[PDB]
Amino acid sequence: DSKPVVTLTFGFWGDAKEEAVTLAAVKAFEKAYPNIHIQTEFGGPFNQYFTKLSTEVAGGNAPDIMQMDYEYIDAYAKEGQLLNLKGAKGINISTISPSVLKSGYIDGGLYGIPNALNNYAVIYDEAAFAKAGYHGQRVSWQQWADILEKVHKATGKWAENDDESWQTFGYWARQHGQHLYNASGTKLGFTESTLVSYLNYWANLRKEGVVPPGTVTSLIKQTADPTDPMVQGKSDAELTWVNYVVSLQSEMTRSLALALPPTQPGGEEGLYIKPSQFWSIYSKTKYPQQAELFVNFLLNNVQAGKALGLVRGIPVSSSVRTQLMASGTSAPEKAEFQLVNEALKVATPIDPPPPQHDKEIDQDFANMVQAVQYGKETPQQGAEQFMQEANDLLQN
Numbered sequence: 001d002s003k004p005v006v007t008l009t010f011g012f013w014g015d016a017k018e019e020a021v022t023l024a025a026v027k028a029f030e031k032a033y034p035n036i037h038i039q040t041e042f043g044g045p046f047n048q049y050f051t052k053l054s055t056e057v058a059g060g061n062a063p064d065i066m067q068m069d070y071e072y073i074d075a076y077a078k079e080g081q082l083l084n085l086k087g088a089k090g091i092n093i094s095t096i097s098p099s100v101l102k103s104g105y106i107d108g109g110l111y112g113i114p115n116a117l118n119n120y121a122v123i124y125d126e127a128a129f130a131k132a133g134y135h136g137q138r139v140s141w142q143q144w145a146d147i148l149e150k151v152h153k154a155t156g157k158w159a160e161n162d163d164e165s166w167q168t169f170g171y172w173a174r175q176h177g178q179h180l181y182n183a184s185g186t187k188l189g190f191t192e193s194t195l196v197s198y199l200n201y202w203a204n205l206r207k208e209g210v211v212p213p214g215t216v217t218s219l220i221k222q223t224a225d226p227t228d229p230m231v232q233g234k235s236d237a238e239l240t241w242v243n244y245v246v247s248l249q250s251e252m253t254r255s256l257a258l259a260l261p262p263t264q265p266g267g268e269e270g271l272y273i274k275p276s277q278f279w280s281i282y283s284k285t286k287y288p289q290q291a292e293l294f295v296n297f298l299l300n301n302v303q304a305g306k307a308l309g310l311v312r313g314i315p316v317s318s319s320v321r322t323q324l325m326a327s328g329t330s331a332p333e334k335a336e337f338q339l340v341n342e343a344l345k346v347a348t349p350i351d352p353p354p355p356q357h358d359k360e361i362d363q364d365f366a367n368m369v370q371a372v373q374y375g376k377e378t379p380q381q382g383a384e385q386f387m388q389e390a391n392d393l394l395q396n
Contacts, residue, residue: 006287007037008294012067013049014042017311024307029297036290057081064291068112068280070103070353076280077106083281083288084109090292092300095317102349103275112278113299116313119273119343120171122259123230123245124237128155129257136259141201144262145210151236152210161220161229162211162373163239164202166365170351171271172198175264185355187391192383199372199379206373211235214373224248241274242336242343243313249332256332258339260346271343272350276313314340361390 012022019042026038041063043049050072056062062081076082085091086109093101096113104112129135132150139147148159170180172194179189205211212229221227224247229235231251238248239261249256261271279298281291298304305320306328314336315321321337329337368386371377377385 001033001035001293003035003290005035005037006290007039008065008285008287008291009039009041009063010065010294011041011043011049011053011063013044013046015045021308021311025298025304028301028303028307029294032297032301032303033293036294038294062282062284064282064285064287065294066280066282067115068278070275070278070350073104073112073278073280074106074353077109077111081283082111083283083285083291084111085113085281085292085295086110088292090289091296095300095319097273097344097347099347099349100273100275100316100344103273104278112280113295114273114275114277114316115279115298116276116308117273117316117340118241118243118276118313119271119340119347120168120239120261121242121245121339121343122160122237122239122261123242123248123256124160124259126255126257128157128159128236128254131155136257138260139262140265141262142265145201145205148205148210148237149208152208155236157233158212158229158235159210160205160237160239161235162202162206162214162217164198164369164373166362168239169195169198169365171261172264173270174272174348174351175267175270177268179351181351181354181394183352185352185394187394188387192380192387195383195387196379199369199383203372203379214370214375217373218370224251242339243310245336246310246330246332256335258335260339260342269346269348271347273340273343273347274350275316310336355394357390357393361393364389 014022023040026040030038043052068076100114100117101110103114104110128151131154132147134147151159173179173190176194178191178194182189202211206213212235216229219227223238223240223244224231230238230248242258245256245258279295281288281295285291300317300319302320302323305315305324310333315324325334325337365386368382372379372382
């Protein structure tokens with residue numbers, strides 16, 4: 001490009017590692033496009049960044065490019081602070097899945113482009129599952145339960161963790177044409193029946209000894225922690241975020257593989273791609289063409305991709321993934337990229353952002369799940385109790 005020199009300001013949040021890789025990407029950009037200066041406005045961690053950004057934007061001091069979060073994009077977009085990127089001449093969105101792009105839409109306009117991705121996967125011990133003749137194909141929940149039973153029979157170990165959580169329930173609910181919340185977040189978006197069928201599915205696996213008992217599950221601090229039975233070699237699979245494969249694989253010599261999570265016959269597609277964050281442009285930027293060129297560079301340029309790495313998640317661009325698969329990724333990273341490519345074929349858009357009480361409700365769900373796993377209450381009792389509690393909280 002040969003236009004007069006301009007400067008773009010670029011606001012973003014992160015920890016120290018995120019700051020470093022972002023500055024490295026900016027370095028690469030400034031070399032590639034020497035008639036565009038980037039003035040970074042690193043805002044510190046998430047909350048600090050958004051607290052300051054709100055006051056700066058309201059006062060006319062918005063940066064030209066803004067890292068944006070799913071929680072806040074509606075507010076910024078509706079106020080008119082974000083440039084509509086739909087059909088932007090300078091941004092190549094042919095490398096991004098439509099379902100993923102939908103997450104940046106507000107009332108027909110595109111106000112942010114996801115910059116990195118995550119999604120659910122089954123992470124499994126290849127050699128263990130080969131004993132049941134399972135080699136990673138996508139299966140139904142009932143087919144999966146049969147496979148787990150066969151693996152357990154062959155190994156005497158747990159075939160999978162008891163992977164009950166609010167967000168894996170979200171996946172199940174979506175398969176049943178429902179959602180954790182209704183669109184406005186004023187009530188739960190699923191029925192008791194849907195939750196009880198989920199709880200019963202896992203309860204049956206516990207009964208058969210195929211997933212760990214509640215007393216074992218209760219010790220797990222986080223996926224890939226030393227308290228995770230997969231890390232201990234006591235379980236042979238886990239349904240979790242695909243990003244965990246790098247951490248998990250680093251903790252054990254047994255080869256791990258990835259499958260898409262199980263399906264519900266007669267159901268809808270549960271899988272979605274979670275956008276880690278978004279790139280957005282100020283609606284009133286003086287330099288929209290250069291801003292688009294910068295965002296496009298971050299999304300699609302391989303030098304940017306190498307600089308940014310996997311810090312925020314899996315690269316959003318198919319071209320960047322292809323080029324990083326060829327060179328610049330470890331074996332587990334390559335596996336992640338391949339899984340995400342399969343996920344993108346099936347995934348539907350993520351649900352709208354949750355209501356303010358989500359963190360508490362998530363914790364209440366986990367506590368109910370734990371009570372059910374311990375045998376302190378029945379699935380139906382736990383479902384009823386949890387739902388009444390959550391709906392009361394959402395209504396207040």
